[PDB]
């Protein structure tokens, strides 16, 4: 995986201070050096590859690692 | 995603499914027409792609969707 994508996965794959999904703007907050359009492109490629799952949320979007939604529902 | 890989992801991406630990032979049980080595290569590709994570467990190996280990722990 390329470094920018690996940094998304590593943030999400954390025990402490984490949850099943984060806003688009949580990722731009974490990678302020990147263009926001490029953050959207890398997140979308990770959803297409099924590393991430995608959600609509209100007026924006959320992302988490594949399976996190069902795992949290299970509880 | 190729069909066998998608079958593994869909099997794991479920509520029932997230409550459980699945070992290598549980996946080979789902692919009776395949050699164990072919299933190991499918699962290893999914680990490389970081769709799955895996580790050694007991006498075998355990596979889950990426992040499952640390979600559950939290």
UniProtKB/Swiss-Prot annotation, chain A:
This is Protein DsvD. May play an essential role in dissimilatory sulfite reduction. To A.fulgidus DsrD. Pfam families: DsrD. It comes from Nitratidesulfovibrio vulgaris (strain ATCC 29579 / DSM 644 / CCUG 34227 / NCIMB 8303 / VKM B-1760 / Hildenborough) (Desulfovibrio vulgaris). SUPFAM superfamilies: Winged helix' DNA-binding domain. The gene is dsvD. InterPro entries: DsrD, WH-like_DNA-bd_sf, WH_DNA-bd_sf.
């Amino acid at each position: 995986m390329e470094e920018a994508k690996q940094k998304v996965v590593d943030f999400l794959n954390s025990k402490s201070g984490s949850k099943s999904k984060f806003y688009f703007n949580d990722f731009t907050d974490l990678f302020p050096d990147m263009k926001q359009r490029e953050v959207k492109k890398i997140l979308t490629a990770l959803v297409n590859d099924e590393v991430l799952e995608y959600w609509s949320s209100g007026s924006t979007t959320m992302y988490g690692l594949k399976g996190a939604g069902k795992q949290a529902a299970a509880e």
